[PDB]
Design a protein around this ligand. Structure first.
Ligand SMILES: [N+]
Ligand SMILES: [N+]
Ligand SMILES: [N+]
Ligand code: NA
Ligand code: NA
Lengths: 188, 178, 179
């Protein structure tokens, strides 16, 4: 996990205008709570010498569909504000961005390809919701022969109950650790 | 309307008293699945297919946490054994879809809905369900057709599945085909 | 193929500024020759009542050996064949329109059973898309005068390979079959 020529990708899953924040139209209540921890990890990674760690930003970007009775769908639509990353956790110029239309960051995307190209062996999961899109991305990373780390305080769900049971499922096949621990692990 | 019922990991390694990697829930559902098998097998026409999915890892001081290809542990339990017309998929990862020909079979057969049974609810069943949806299938989860290591896992497992899946009992599903 | 329940997608492969035109930096000489036929097809489809046929536009969009980088002018579709508002656009980083993209899903969602191929190069990116479409159990039509390659000889042998696994037709023939 940490030694050797280990190369890691931190995936940030759906920290978007639609979902995150008190005023969010599609608000996931858990998300606001993880922002400072995420900011902290962003700063640390950006600070770091070299690139043994990559930040990858994943956004739900559903296709615009005019053939719908409601004024807006209950998901983030591509090209909109809601789809866009929150200013607090906005991507920086060199950072890869992935758009997805299904739960997993992998599904029908170029994430696996990015990961292969960059020689990445471990994915580390952050974002919302821990029990849905986060877990799905993890399952998929595992299925694609990546190692997986879930950051327990880097993830959140609609409810604290969901988050905890999500962590439980994640613990079965991923390594679960806090943000501080992950950082300390690299300090070695 | 055409359906595929996916039966996931009802295998020697996993189900039964003497299974080495016992999932206790699996024994509980066997009668329900048996019901489903007979009903489908006896049904008129091919509106519903039975697809059997078996974990089959590669061989070879490693913790034996998975069913291995060609071993007894990998094989289906007799109670729920496949009949010759029924498609079988071996998988090396959690999902029935991952690195498999499952999607192609569903496309081939013009199946538009998948119905989920087997074990574990929150793991391999969930993963298969997520992939089906990702591939634009409609998804049904059979609540008394699925099980997990613990009842709590199953229960929260259903909770997640209910988010993007239609959850119903076995009788309701059969009943709904009338 | 044109039978009643059929829904079709026409895939337009790589008709981009970098590739098409006398002065394109990565010119494929063939590409300029098919522009009028494709325009005829675009007009016809856009014209048609109903939703039996979709136009899907596919662009190479490599990330930052000369190739078309995403977000550049060169990567953009030529004006002659520019996408209209409701027409799906797929960006790719490898030869096939399928590979690491959301094309299959789009096709799945819309209930399309057949893909019809256009664009360049016949023997490279077009063929690969065609091969993947078949692999994903779509029927495939190739349009012989709706496709082109760097050289005529390449185009011809590409059509030959394509004839092995696809139904090859002219643009006019394809339009007629829907009438
Ligand atoms: N979508
Ligand atoms: N395996
Ligand atoms: N690329
Ligand atoms: Na999953
Ligand atoms: Na090919």
């Amino acid at each position: 996990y940490f030694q050797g020529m280990a190369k890691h990708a931190i995936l940030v899953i759906d920290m978007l205008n639609d979902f995150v924040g008190e005023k969010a139209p599609l608000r996931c209540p858990g998300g606001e709570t993880i922002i400072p921890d995420l900011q902290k990890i962003f700063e640390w990674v950006r600070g770091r010498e070299g690139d043994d760690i990559h930040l990858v930003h994943i956004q739900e970007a559903h296709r615009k569909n005019d053939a719908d009775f409601r004024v807006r769908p209950l998901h983030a639509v591509k090209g909109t504000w809601g789809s866009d990353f929150i200013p607090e956790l906005y991507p920086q110029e060199d950072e890869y961005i992935v758009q997805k239309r299904r739960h997993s960051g992998f599904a029908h995307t170029d994430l696996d390809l990015y990961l292969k190209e960059e020689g990445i062996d471990t994915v580390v999961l952050t974002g919302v919701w821990t029990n849905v899109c986060v877990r799905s991305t993890a399952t998929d990373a595992l299925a694609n022969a990546y190692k997986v780390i879930t950051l327990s305080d880097g993830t959140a769900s609609k409810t604290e109950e969901m988050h905890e049971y999500g962590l439980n499922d994640l613990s079965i096949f991923t390594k679960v650790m806090t943000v501080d621990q992950y950082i300390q692990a690299w300090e070695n």
